[PDB]
Amino acid sequence: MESITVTELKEKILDANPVNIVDVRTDQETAMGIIPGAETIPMNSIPDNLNYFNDNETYYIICKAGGRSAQVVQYLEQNGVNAVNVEGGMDEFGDEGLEH
Numbered sequence: 770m771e772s773i774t775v776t777e778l779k780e781k782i783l784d785a786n787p788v789n790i791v792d793v794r795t796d797q798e799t800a801m802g803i804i805p806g807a808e809t810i811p812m813n814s815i816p817d818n819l820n821y822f823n824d825n826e827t828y829y830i831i832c833k834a835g836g837r838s839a840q841v842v843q844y845l846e847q848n849g850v851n852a853v854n855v856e857g858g859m860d861e862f863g864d865e866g867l868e869h
């Protein structure tokens with residue numbers, strides 16, 4: 770499985786194009802704020818939303834703590850999707866600069 774740190778993810782903002790981020794937390798959690806540009810698809814619904822993922826692209830998956838997102842990454846890869854886990858989750862990403 771592939772993974773990157775939150776520090777690495779933030780520095781990605783300084784790159785040419787924005788990366789694809791998928792926030793798999795639940796509704797009330799995302800209600801507290803999300804990373805600008807992130808798509809919200811709860812983990813439980815990932816199996817029914819495979820059509821969202823473009824096979825030619827890569828998706829960075831984030832959750833509250835980093836474990837559940839890793840589970841989603843493995844699931845996605847085993848279904849032909851390119852995914853990377855964001856280590857530490859939103860806990861480590863922090864509550865600064867989020868979209869409310």
Ligand code: NA
Nearest residue numbers: 808809810811
């Ligand atoms: Na959504």
